[PDB]
Design an enzyme around this catalytic site. Structure first.
Site, PDB file in Angstrom:
ATOM      1  N   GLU A 290      44.343  43.688  30.368  1.00  0.00           N
ATOM      2  CA  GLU A 290      44.821  41.925  30.754  1.00  0.00           C
ATOM      3  C   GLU A 290      43.840  41.967  31.697  1.00  0.00           C
ATOM      4  O   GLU A 290      44.553  42.206  32.346  1.00  0.00           O
ATOM      5  CB  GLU A 290      46.079  41.273  30.048  1.00  0.00           C
ATOM      6  CG  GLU A 290      46.859  42.142  29.208  1.00  0.00           C
ATOM      7  CD  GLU A 290      48.009  41.401  28.823  1.00  0.00           C
ATOM      8  OE1 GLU A 290      48.870  40.260  29.282  1.00  0.00           O
ATOM      9  OE2 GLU A 290      49.497  41.997  28.635  1.00  0.00           O
ATOM     10  N   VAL A 291      43.347  40.756  31.970  1.00  0.00           N
ATOM     11  CA  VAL A 291      42.683  40.282  32.964  1.00  0.00           C
ATOM     12  C   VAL A 291      42.627  38.260  32.781  1.00  0.00           C
ATOM     13  O   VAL A 291      42.545  37.677  32.117  1.00  0.00           O
ATOM     14  CB  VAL A 291      40.998  40.007  33.134  1.00  0.00           C
ATOM     15  CG1 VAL A 291      40.571  39.500  33.778  1.00  0.00           C
ATOM     16  CG2 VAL A 291      41.016  41.455  32.161  1.00  0.00           C
TER      17      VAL A 291
ATOM     18  N   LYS B 201      42.929  42.165  37.020  1.00  0.00           N
ATOM     19  CA  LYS B 201      43.160  42.697  36.114  1.00  0.00           C
ATOM     20  C   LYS B 201      44.356  43.404  36.135  1.00  0.00           C
ATOM     21  O   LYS B 201      44.899  44.114  36.871  1.00  0.00           O
ATOM     22  CB  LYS B 201      42.205  44.001  35.588  1.00  0.00           C
ATOM     23  CG  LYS B 201      42.191  45.291  35.478  1.00  0.00           C
ATOM     24  CD  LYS B 201      41.336  45.817  34.607  1.00  0.00           C
ATOM     25  CE  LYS B 201      40.995  47.044  33.227  1.00  0.00           C
ATOM     26  NZ  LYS B 201      40.465  46.007  32.195  1.00  0.00           N
TER      27      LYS B 201
ATOM     28  N   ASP C  43      34.443  54.768  31.295  1.00  0.00           N
ATOM     29  CA  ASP C  43      34.453  53.772  30.728  1.00  0.00           C
ATOM     30  C   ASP C  43      33.458  52.723  30.717  1.00  0.00           C
ATOM     31  O   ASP C  43      33.828  51.736  29.962  1.00  0.00           O
ATOM     32  CB  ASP C  43      36.188  53.086  30.782  1.00  0.00           C
ATOM     33  CG  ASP C  43      36.644  52.405  29.379  1.00  0.00           C
ATOM     34  OD1 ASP C  43      37.865  52.626  29.312  1.00  0.00           O
ATOM     35  OD2 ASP C  43      35.839  52.041  28.309  1.00  0.00           O
TER      36      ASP C  43
ATOM     37  N   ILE D  34      41.643  35.553  30.679  1.00  0.00           N
ATOM     38  CA  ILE D  34      40.315  35.672  30.009  1.00  0.00           C
ATOM     39  C   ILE D  34      39.157  36.859  29.610  1.00  0.00           C
ATOM     40  O   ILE D  34      38.447  37.220  28.882  1.00  0.00           O
ATOM     41  CB  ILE D  34      39.110  35.147  31.208  1.00  0.00           C
ATOM     42  CG1 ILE D  34      39.588  36.684  32.556  1.00  0.00           C
ATOM     43  CG2 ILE D  34      38.945  34.667  32.448  1.00  0.00           C
ATOM     44  CD1 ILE D  34      38.505  36.594  33.572  1.00  0.00           C
ATOM     45  N   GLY D  35      40.787  38.062  30.240  1.00  0.00           N
ATOM     46  CA  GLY D  35      40.639  39.773  29.258  1.00  0.00           C
ATOM     47  C   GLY D  35      41.834  39.996  28.052  1.00  0.00           C
ATOM     48  O   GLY D  35      42.018  41.106  28.753  1.00  0.00           O
TER      49      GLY D  35
HETATM   50  N1  LIG Z   1      34.886  40.533  37.505  1.00  0.00           N
HETATM   51  C1  LIG Z   1      35.023  39.213  36.238  1.00  0.00           C
HETATM   52  N2  LIG Z   1      34.594  38.338  36.365  1.00  0.00           N
HETATM   53  C2  LIG Z   1      34.365  37.617  35.401  1.00  0.00           C
HETATM   54  N3  LIG Z   1      34.524  37.920  33.917  1.00  0.00           N
HETATM   55  C3  LIG Z   1      35.746  39.124  33.802  1.00  0.00           C
HETATM   56  C4  LIG Z   1      35.419  39.857  34.917  1.00  0.00           C
HETATM   57  N4  LIG Z   1      36.641  41.264  34.376  1.00  0.00           N
HETATM   58  C5  LIG Z   1      36.553  41.387  33.088  1.00  0.00           C
HETATM   59  N5  LIG Z   1      36.530  39.774  32.719  1.00  0.00           N
HETATM   60  C6  LIG Z   1      36.713  39.730  31.258  1.00  0.00           C
HETATM   61  O1  LIG Z   1      37.027  40.351  30.762  1.00  0.00           O
HETATM   62  C7  LIG Z   1      37.112  40.923  29.107  1.00  0.00           C
HETATM   63  C8  LIG Z   1      37.279  42.766  29.809  1.00  0.00           C
HETATM   64  O2  LIG Z   1      38.441  42.603  30.218  1.00  0.00           O
HETATM   65  P1  LIG Z   1      39.102  44.054  30.202  1.00  0.00           P
HETATM   66  O3  LIG Z   1      40.334  43.907  30.905  1.00  0.00           O
HETATM   67  O4  LIG Z   1      38.938  45.307  31.011  1.00  0.00           O
HETATM   68  O5  LIG Z   1      38.833  44.521  28.539  1.00  0.00           O
HETATM   69  P2  LIG Z   1      37.924  45.580  27.936  1.00  0.00           P
HETATM   70  O6  LIG Z   1      36.564  45.893  29.440  1.00  0.00           O
HETATM   71  O7  LIG Z   1      37.593  45.903  26.623  1.00  0.00           O
HETATM   72  N6  LIG Z   1      38.646  47.663  27.883  1.00  0.00           N
HETATM   73  P3  LIG Z   1      39.439  48.275  30.017  1.00  0.00           P
HETATM   74  O8  LIG Z   1      38.133  47.763  30.966  1.00  0.00           O
HETATM   75  O9  LIG Z   1      38.800  50.117  28.886  1.00  0.00           O
HETATM   76  O10 LIG Z   1      40.437  48.018  29.869  1.00  0.00           O
HETATM   77  C9  LIG Z   1      35.397  40.616  29.451  1.00  0.00           C
HETATM   78  O11 LIG Z   1      35.037  40.224  28.259  1.00  0.00           O
HETATM   79  C10 LIG Z   1      34.672  39.195  30.836  1.00  0.00           C
HETATM   80  O12 LIG Z   1      34.961  37.615  30.471  1.00  0.00           O
HETATM   81 MG   LIG Z   2      36.820  45.482  32.033  1.00  0.00          MG
END
Ligand SMILES: Nc1ncnc2c1ncn2[C@@H]1O[C@H](COP(=O)(O)OP(=O)(O)NP(=O)(O)O)[C@@H](O)[C@H]1O
Ligand SMILES: [Mg+2]
Length: 295
Positions: free
Chosen positions: A32-33, A49, A145, A30-31
């Site tokens: 790496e998440v 994450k 951030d 979904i995100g």
């Molecule tokens: N607790 C969460 N619940 C649901 N979706 C999430 C959650 N955390 C992250 N996401 C999803 O993952 C995406 C962003 O993940 P992320 O790895 O943090 O990238 P980023 O925020 O753009 N860069 P960074 O956080 O600085 O490393 C978001 O658009 C969410 O859809």
């Molecule tokens: Mg994030």
């Protein structure tokens, strides 16, 4: 190995799948998440994450332990932290509403709407979380951030700030700026960071001000509209329109002429103060929250 910060994870073995590589390969990204189902619970969904261990690596564990004990209405709680020799895993609850970034992007495409009361609630939530981190937690926590991707929405449509506190999770300043250019989020980096290379509370204030401006303008800093505008940036364009003959032009046309014009112009002024080039000129989180609540 792993620290449990929430009662939602009964046993540590419930997170054993996080140490299985072929099990991680199957998880949804979904995100790496990643996105998975908590084995111990009766159908609770978790977002995991993955951060890379810094090459430095000793302070991030104490920072993670500090983050694991922070609880606020507008802060995303950290359920557990799993430590592998290659990387770290931060476990949060999966928010099916998504992030403010996703919601605003879908609002641009017409697949979703977001009213002004909801945006004001989100802004007040981010203000409360930022104030708790800046001025209320016993050690002062700097986000470093802040952006709409690190603000999620719960089932009450309340803002919840995420991905904060970990000072060692950040890369160097140059790499951070370049990867924020590629991700289209350089608009949240305060000007001073290009000369100081240090994250302060005023940088979070600048990011919050950019988010505040987005909530009214309805456009992201990465919009090509600002590349086709005279000021060449969202902040400067907003700063000129606020003092122009007709400031209401900065309002998102979806929110315009619905009885909330003066309120949106007030939060535009607040964002303008939050995004001044000099950090000492910007207000602190308490003043930002008070001004946002004075409407
Ligand atoms: N607790 C969460 N619940 C649901 N979706 C999430 C959650 N955390 C992250 N996401 C999803 O993952 C995406 C962003 O993940 P992320 O790895 O943090 O990238 P980023 O925020 O753009 N860069 P960074 O956080 O600085 O490393 C978001 O658009 C969410 O859809
Ligand atoms: Mg994030």
């Amino acid at each position: 190995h792993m620290s449990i910060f929430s009662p939602l994870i009964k046993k540590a073995e419930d997170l054993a799948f996080l140490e299985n590589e072929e099990a991680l390969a199957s998880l949804e990204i979904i995100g790496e998440v990643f996105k998975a189902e908590l084995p111990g619970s009766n159908g609770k969904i978790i977002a995991v994450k993955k951060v890379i261990q810094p090459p430095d690596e000793r302070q991030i564990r104490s920072e993670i332990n500090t983050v694991g004990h922070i609880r606020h209405r507008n802060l995303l709680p950290l359920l557990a932290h799993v430590s592998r020799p290659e990387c770290h895993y931060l476990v949060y609850e999966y928010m099916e509403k998504g992030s403010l970034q996703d919601i605003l992007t879908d609002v641009q495409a017409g697949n979703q709407e977001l009213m002004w009361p909801a945006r004001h609630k989100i802004a007040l939530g981010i203000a409360a979380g930022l104030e708790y981190l800046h001025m209320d937690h016993n050690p002062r926590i700097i986000h470093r951030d802040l952006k709409p991707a690190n603000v999620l929405l719960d089932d009450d449509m309340e803002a919840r700030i995420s991905d904060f506190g970990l000072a060692k999770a950040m890369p160097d300043a140059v790499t951070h700026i370049t990867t924020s250019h590629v991700a289209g989020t350089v608009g949240y980096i305060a000007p001073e960071f290009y000369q100081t290379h240090k994250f302060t509370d005023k940088c979070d204030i600048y990011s919050f001000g950019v988010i505040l401006g987005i909530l009214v303008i309805g456009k992201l800093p990465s919009d090509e509209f600002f590349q086709h505008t005279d000021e060449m940036s969202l902040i400067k364009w907003m700063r000129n329109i606020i003092t122009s003959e007709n400031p209401s032009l900065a309002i998102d046309p979806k929110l315009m002429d619905q009885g909330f014009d003066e309120q949106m112009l007030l939060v535009l002024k607040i964002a303008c103060y939050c995004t001044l080039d000099d950090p000492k000129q910007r207000p602190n989180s308490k003043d930002v929250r008070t001004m946002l609540s004075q409407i």
